[model samples]
Target: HSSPRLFMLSSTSSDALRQTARQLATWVEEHQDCVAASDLAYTLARGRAHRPVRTAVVAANLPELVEGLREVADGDALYDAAVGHGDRGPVWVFSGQGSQWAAMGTQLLASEPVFAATIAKLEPVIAAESGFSVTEAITAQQTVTGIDKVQPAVFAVQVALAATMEQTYGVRPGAVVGHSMGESAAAVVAGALSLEDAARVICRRSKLMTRIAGAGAMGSVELPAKQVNSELMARGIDDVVVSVVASPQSTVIGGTSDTVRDLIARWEQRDVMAREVAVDVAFHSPQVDPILDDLAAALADIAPMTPKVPYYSATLFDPREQPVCDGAYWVDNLRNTVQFAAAVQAAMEDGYRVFAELSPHPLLTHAVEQTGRSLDMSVAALAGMRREQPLPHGLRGLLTELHRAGAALDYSALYPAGRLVDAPLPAWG
Candidate 1:
């Protein structure tokens, strides 16, 4: 019955913070076995008064926890710690496609009410626009595949992930960016579009993709963009085009179905490590010409508001330029080359030090890391979830990584399941 409660200690001053840590460990020495492993984990995680100074310690037992606390108090390395200092949070990155896996978001939907409720709310809205229920697809209520199932599902989870970060843990993005179709979700996060409008755009776009799903194909090549193109040109391969410049050495090429397959085969023969993307439709390439008329038509009547958060355009040549998220932009969003590296560089130039991808699994972390390293920026790339990890564990890794990388977060309200009681307060005896 006496489950130990988690607690938070906070101070805006370094001296006070260290003193509190020392006092907390001293107090805990008398109160041995009063705290469980998770008690400290959640309490410090849950407490979110992100001032200039605050201390949170996690240990297996009282003995280790106390020294870990005192070690910090003595200005020694607490696992080589750094008290994150800044309100400027990580840039929230949303993935377009290729991040979806079977049963994606099932854990988030089941464990967190806020996440589930957001998806529940999005179900009808997306269904109304797409004439299909993504809820069933995501919830395993019904089985489906192709664009009809995944695009909306990805958007749904994207929105829910965005919502959970703020609504549940108070983790807010400094700015937002979307890789390809993920731009719709970014628009909503940036306050440039309402949920209804984004749903309309996402759902309709998916339908358009469905109409020409098998007409083309795409492959990712682990080579630089210039080399990929040069190699394509050298081979006289005119049917394919480089679709996305993922990073310095990663490019996504899309074109005719047979041509893409041939390219993959050729690369495999050459030991170049190129592989086919599961997406049947060749998104972001010359092959998308058939749907342009329908795409603009579908988005023509919709309205896009100015974003409250900075929305970086991955389709633009100059990513820093302000983008009007109009029908034409969405059209271009699919048809144009996704300048992902450019957008990331722009974010880096604009002072983003942390990159967090919100998706079912991590597909862009490598690209982001590559770009950041190329630019000589000390960037920390974090993902909200992975295909194999539980939702809570994945999220824990995210917060833990971000904090470790020196991004200050108010963990005051992260894990409310465990009760919080401050360890040392008002002059600990």
Candidate 2:
């Protein structure tokens, strides 16, 4: 083909990372039909010889590759191109923190006025739950970006953004996944948790995290998963733990900084690429042992209701492996390590090649790129990451195009009289 091929790959990477990569890839794919370059499927297999430029181009175009496969049919050019080149299929994913910033969604507020109203309404509710005014929380989130406040603020904004996107563009994800704090947002969108409950959970979770920060020990390292865990175990670091397994190569190992440092030294001695993470309070690791009881008690105050849609998945356990509504799942999710990579792996097994990222950041999308499968646009951005272009400020125009596209997709239909049905949904002023 004369145009560059938009190849996609399936990824068993963590949700947060995959989602970031998907956003970029999807944008390229949607625009590729309008752009040019040759969309070439390699005639040579993975083991065959190739040029450095070819190799660099492919490696750099990971997002492009995944996006290509996502929107294209099985026999389409990108798919055939990927297979001929020996790249795997596609998998969609989302991301977690390390990417959130102040005023994350101001653009949405401007371009999509309805979403602004949604945020205005939700801010106070979320703030009230956290014992602050909605304006205070929103401003703090924008100015301070404190973890204590940021986590919850991100949850509120994410749900608001997802909800707004649904209203504006008529785009609802085929499946839903989230990373760490992002999960709460996904829960509300998927109907697993009400908007109110999600806000409460995020606050409670953050509070629990803060309250336990003293006794709970946590650490971070830059080593591969199995090797790092085994190394830590051998060092006799009993309490040291591996928490969020972001990728096969990079796992968040936490316990105490001392043990973490020791492990890092050992890794350096072995010439493995490893680094210490900035914020280390033993999140999702054994160091959180101190907070278990407190968290359990907090969980007792709320009950989980059934999810609103079938697209929900969790980092704690396979939602398909058991009922997501089961109280134990959420309870265990608090103390257990986040098996994000495993979660994505399971998602791949279920034939989910498209993973649309709900807003907040782009970490998950990048993680998906690093994983095994090809990522794609079916899981692209609903809104831009920041206030400007890369983040997609004005959503009204984008939504209009998406709504008019010829696809089985229908956000308005789901709500018809409901959002998925006719125009004039609410019929008020």
Off by over 4 Å in 2: 1-94, 134-142, 214-224, 311-319, 322-328, 374-393, 396-408, 411-429
Model 2 scores worst on lDDT over the 10 consecutive residues at 418-427
**For residues 1-429, what per-residue lDDT tens digits would candidate 1 score against the true structure?**
233323345554666677777887887787776665565556555544444444556555677778877877899433323323555777889888767766776777777778888888888887778777676677673334778667888889889888877777667778888889889899889897888788888888888888787778889988898998998899999889999998888999999888888988988898898989877788888778899989899899878888888778897777877677888989999999998988888888888877889888888998999988898767777888877676543354566566655575556556645656454443422
Candidate 1 stretches greater than 4 Å from native: 1-26, 31-87, 141-144, 392-397, 411-429
Tell me the tens digit of each residue's lDDT in model 2 across 1-429: 333321212222223223423453465456545433322222111112321111111223434565343433222222111111112212223355455565566556666665677678777666666665544554344543545676766666666666666665456654566666667776777677777777777777677677655443444455557976787677666777777776555677776767766766677787876666655366666666676777667667565667655433545555454235333555566567777766665655554543445555555654443443333322222232433244343554333322222112343232233111111111111
lDDT of 2 at 321: 49
Tell me each candidate's TM-score.
Answer: 0.82, 0.65
RMSD (Cα, Å) of model 1: 5.3
On the 0 to 100 scale, the lDDT of residue 28 in model 1 is 77
Model 1: lowest-lDDT 10 consecutive positions: 76-85
Residue 136 displacement in candidate 1 (angstroms)? 1.9
Provide the lDDT at 178 for model 1: 88
Tell me the deviation in Å of residue 425 in model 1.
12
